[model samples]
Target chain A: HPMNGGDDSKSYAQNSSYQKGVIEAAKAEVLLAIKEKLDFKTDWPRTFVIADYGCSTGPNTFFAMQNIVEAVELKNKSLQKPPIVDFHVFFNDLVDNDFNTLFKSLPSARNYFAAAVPGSFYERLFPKASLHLANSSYALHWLSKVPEEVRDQNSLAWNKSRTYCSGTNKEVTGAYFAQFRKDLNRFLNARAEELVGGGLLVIQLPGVPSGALPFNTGAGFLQELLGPCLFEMADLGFISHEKVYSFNLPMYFPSIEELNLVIKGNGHFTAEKIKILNHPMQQLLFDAKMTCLQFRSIFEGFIKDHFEVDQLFDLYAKKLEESCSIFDQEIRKDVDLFVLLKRVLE
Target chain B: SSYQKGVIEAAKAEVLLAIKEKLDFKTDWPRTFVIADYGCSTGPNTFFAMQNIVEAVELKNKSLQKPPIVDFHVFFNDLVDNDFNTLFKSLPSARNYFAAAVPGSFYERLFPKASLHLANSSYALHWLSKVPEEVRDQNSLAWNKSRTYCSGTNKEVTGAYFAQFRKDLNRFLNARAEELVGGGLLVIQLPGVPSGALPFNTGAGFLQELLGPCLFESHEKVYSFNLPMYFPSIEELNLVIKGNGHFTAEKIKILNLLFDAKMTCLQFRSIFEGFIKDHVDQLFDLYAKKLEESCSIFDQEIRKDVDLFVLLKRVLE
Candidate 1:
């Protein structure tokens, strides 16, 4: 397995630069969709409750909440009642998520009620019929836990591409959609129970074009890029093969039509808006170089806590610098942000 | 509940052995031991208990110079709504352990004649289908005197619960008499009420008095109570066993145990904290604390009672 970076907190904090842009992009798309799609009368309260599903400790979570708060406030002022909209922001993630760091970053909005719910969203996380809106970005792809069938058998169902070092493209796509069905059902069911009648759920994630490339071929690009650096690090004893193999952040990029199918399956939810943006970050960094930062961020604490920091840093810098020189621009790094409005009642 | 499931399964193993050792199962019979456990819930504990029974039977059989081929058959029976998939997946690694998915009530079911060497049911026979309809119209104060205190105020409680237990026990005796070849044994472990005592805070008592009251006050109609019938004392169980005239009680043991206060409190709290919060959010936390306190009271009362009854029976020609 290749190290993505350090523990969720340290890794997320260190990579705030990348996350800031992602959050801002997602926020912009969400706000634009709300403005263009929904009809707001003076009686409608502009208050919103923002839920971050897999929000690790980083600027991304805070940045996204801030943008949402501002958007709801701006919308509220236009209402005839100038609705005394209060923001109730919920932060959710795996139990191991850096909630302390995430909560620490939240500035006390006398108007905003904040709560930290530590659990997987694969199960219920909110009170029934209590939320107004729900939003999750870059999270649903990660399952509650690895399925027992895959973990026990170590079968091809869980195998990743050797060339890309992530999930094989076909498997990745299949896994992503299958997870999408399960997660989306859970998400929609939770919102249906929580939201009064007409609540909205907005989601954004990475995606690939439908006809772009064969699954294995597309996945090979990622493997070829990250494999050697991961192999070299494993050889140097910085990380174990087991850790490398398990260090999978399986993500999928769904096309427009594929996304529509998901929206249709969920009866109460209608896709009011959708957008796909091409991420240019892939062009700026090479695979080996990226893996160096990723590995250091994912396993730095593991290595440092278990080994010496100086030894780990020296190994990381050597691999990173060498990999940086082989940068390529052909890798596609695009993500899609979908904005959905769920009509609670007919 | 998860831990309690384990306790029940462990109790099953003990009951199985009591039948195998205390009764003349081999000299009086000649076949591999066949056992069926009713209401075996989905958990590792079920398989663990089955393993214990199989090992005990094998150990005893190996001692015989001309030991009969012990073809062990274990059947797990439970309600149709149970997660059978999860249970079936965790089955013991025995070559002859069979899965018998029986639907409907176990009390009314028909078993093979002269086929069962031993029949063992644990912790499940206590739940009756419903309460007597006459009891439904009475107030709580009057309802306690109508022979339906433990049983809920459902229309079918009298017929499905009390009457059915007698019917089932009679059927069990008649069936086992024909099924077991003269010397086969049967052991049943379940919750029992102390003879000549008014049911107070028994297992299902708290559900009716505290949780049921709270739910009713909140206008929820789905009220369930403890089974109308329970671990009828050694005397009460013998009354039913002897009524059939074909079976004789070999041994009767009452296991005195304390209910887990913390676990019961947690389950009640989770229910209130999760569901009741939405309807009455303001009073939810307060009610949850009260529910925990009520559980403590129930737990204290339960600690004073014998929680389980293990009865060993043998067919007498």
Candidate 2:
């Protein structure tokens, strides 16, 4: 988030080079679907139905959809007979994402009809058997809602002072994994119901590489930093302790095994391809300073409904910046998982 | 009203057989069943159709040794301005399935893919989406004024009517094909003309006998303004559906029909009571006078002879 939130200032950090990788892989998954000879019992619908889950809205989503339809077009041109399908795309995000600004900043000449569908991806949004293809990127690490089991004092897993699950506490780690499994299964099941037979679904999310420590090969000090910033504020009476206790940011980073295990048990889909990615980014995008600014904008409202003063955001940003600077640089390097799935006849 | 009832009664056996033949009610007793009626105007007949389909399935379930507890969801669809309030308020106190309203044109995709198992449309496709622009165009060959329709008229007027009919009906077929499930069945009932027959084979052309001269601004409007209905030939329908190539037109039966609905001239006028400008009752009285004068000649012996009923299956993708 170079936070121009557009390609302009993101100019410093637009690594679409990696996006092209996910784009081609997603393209391959769809080509495989075409080769498998999956089509609607009828033909192409009036508007080709597409959904980009957890979409924050902008170039990335537009680019992803462009690639997919082009992939469809490329395949279409070769065939002796090609079904003519055209449609709008749906860009989905959570309630907390700033959707007003999202729509206000749309491209004037977008290639496809684009609209916003605001909700969690863990629940079904489109009507059943509607979507032909869907791609969710860098999302789904977020749960449906914060795992209630870890939220309050009366609960077994208070997650104590930690804001997120780190190996620092087994109970907190266990709690996060449990919620991830539940969330991932719900997400998969819902998508399965919405997609046609052999409809392609691809997901890309941050992952910890094989056998690495939870915080080491990934966003270690990042999570390790968010922990005390909110906790210290609660201790300082900047916000309620109850507010802090009951609130867990609903996000989880998974290992490949975790994703595979959850997907295997869901009988509706067959996993098609899984690609591992090791990439570096413009240090500005994930910088502690930028993270602080993004936190105030993206993570603020989720805190205040249960908190007294809205004052925590500005102060919290300052504390978080100072706190995050103390991290071991090893956590900065990251790994990602790009996986694709196809609906299997039940 | 009586004729509408007769048509449904005539449709009963075909509808039931289509349900049994197209859907597997016993083996894959679904947790939910979805059915839709496309031309489901605000009339009692819609309820009758949905009820018949649901009843047919429940009967099949009774004979099976093991049947799943499947609930049903029935969708009633029609044009946007159709009187849905009258229809919704009068849903039966005892009905087998959930009833919902889907208000839109049938000429566009409305339902989810592979979602609908059976779709029924009756007495609607004869209405064109609009008068073909060419017929309305003053420069075109179709502008054969002075006679209201192609009743022993120029060939351009007839060809123009058939062209628009082909376009609208094909749009209807394509949309329904996009919606219906694999092996799903669609039954459509519309007025039809004999092969190579002129417009007089149907009673519609002669309606101009009254409105043709009196209802509009002048005698010219009656001629310039063609009624937005076409009684297509069986060959015309086969050509359109076959060319579209999404449905197998399994059965094309023409019923020898009569104007038994008994919705007399006065009854028809009431349906559009306030639709015309003021002094409309006086206008109907004027039109009724004209209807009576002509009734003596075209009366008992002058009824529409055929109604084309087609049953189609969605082709495999």
Candidate 3:
């Protein structure tokens, strides 16, 4: 698959190279824990299916599935009867997702089967009491939709207190959490239906730091890092304020306590494993230097058709550079990763 | 002075007759007579209401032949925006009448400190100060979509009226607590939501829903043209006023009176016409007609005016 083909399969293929190691480790941990608890090797048939939701158009999906397949195969070898383990691997993304790349990477193994499912996970994705083991990495935090009340008078007043872009006040944070809780409840309920008795579920995503950072103190960072650039573009007539107002990306990096509260509130799943990984990666380095190019690539089509590209890119780049300096160090330094697992009745 | 005294005399006669044979007034002489007729608008009706109370009090005083004089104080208050000259000219003869002109919203203003004997306000609270911006903005809740009316059953005017009424009554109760002396009586007569099996389906109900949409669609520019408060049912009114620490319910009466006979519809139309003439001149003739049409469409039988009158007393600590 070509790396720049605008398809998910090629994108996942590229992502798989970087993420395979971590996924394999996580899968091994889950499989071992399940074996210790259930003693399935002697008692039950070894049939299981693993699903990845919001598996972006990339190689990470295939890479993660490959690890799970290996873990199951190893488990089968230990059984005297070697229970017939039929592997049903499901790959899911939004309707517009690039499935061709994901499909092309399916391993030609006798026991493995692949199916594509699309639509939001806020609604159910599978039939009740069916799935055995479900795995979703780096996805659950995506909100279904942004609430209309977030831009009200109260939120505007609270927004003023934060100096960093990610610095959310209690009200704004509560609003986000409310939406997160609703979406999570829906997801867990759907999962409960899909998984049979004593099934296993694992989810991994970004985790936010527990405490709030000081306002413009240690690092003179603004409340939103990308805010000023967006504003500048809006002022330059590259985008309208209405567009900015309507554009709310649903992303959350919750603390461990926050994640626990979600799990406890659901009351259906028991925690089997929880782990945090600290990764050092310069994800924002290229964008930090080539801000104009990044802006053009992301928003130019929308803006250029409405306004002059050269003027829009110049303004967007200038503002991005000015804002980038605040967190340029942090961006190049650290990434926090979290993993959680629940025991489901298969 | 004689004219005022005559007005008071006639009012007292009317009250004596109205309550006569029903309740024993001589033995059950109300401890206090607190009367207020707001938006009196320099009329004889205002004097008549005050006069009836005065005569009732005087009769009680004569019967008891008491020294304390029954603590008679008539609160002839009006909006600061009202014509005081008209109110003053129409004052009934009351040597005992203590009057004060309150400024600002009756909902928010301060009245005399625990001095009121009987509180009365008629034909005023229905006026709202201004329709809310949510109702007036074309891009607001219901207007954002092309709806024929607001989402609820009650049309915008009635809904806006009640919303303001509920809000104003909350303030009024808070302020009334400080004004009404313990054992003081309150009698209020005003327009009300009529009772029916499908009460919520009434014109008032439709008006409540239409309020948001109509106000948003309206082109009127003046702010004060919109009333800040509204008429409420006996139940809703009691619930609100009861929130004040000082007042307790004694009696609730709904008075149904014939408004017009020969030209009943015309007379009702005139009442609305007068409202527009007095308040909403900023509205174009066409828009005003539309408003009037909307109001008329929701009208019920006019045999008896829907009046919710409550008799309350300031509770003693």
Which candidate has the top score in TM-score?
Answer: 2
Interface RMSD of 3: 37.4
Residue-level error in angstroms, candidate 2, position A277: 1.8
Off by over 4 Å in 2: A1-136, A159-168, A185-202, A210-241, A260-275, A278-333, A340-346, B1-131, B140-162, B174-184, B189-317
Question: What TM-score, computed on C-alpha atoms, does each candidate reach?
Answer: 0.44, 0.50, 0.43
Question: Whose DockQ is higher: candidate 1's or candidate 3's?
Answer: 1
lDDT of 3 by residue, A120-233 (tens): 777666555546667777677667765445645445423332212253456667766777888888888888876766766777664554454223321223225445555666
Local distance difference test, each candidate: 0.54, 0.66, 0.52
State the DockQ of every prediction. Answer: 0.01, 0.03, 0.00
Q: Which stretches of candidate 1 lie over 4 Å from their true place?
A: A1-11, A38-47, A109-111, A147-176, A210-224, A233-253, A278-328, A343-346, B1-317
For residues B1-317, write the lDDT of model 3, one tens digit per residue.
23333433433433464333222333334444545554554456666676666666566566555523544545445554444444544455434554323323566533445435456665565555554445555554422123222223445544554565666666665566666556555555554655542223444334333333443453343222332334466666666676555566666665532222233333334445554455433323333445455544444532133445555566766
Q: Rank the candidates by lDDT, best first.
A: 2, 1, 3
Tens-digit lDDT track for model 1 on B89-119?
4454443443333323455433444545666
A33 Cα displacement, candidate 1 (Å): 2.4
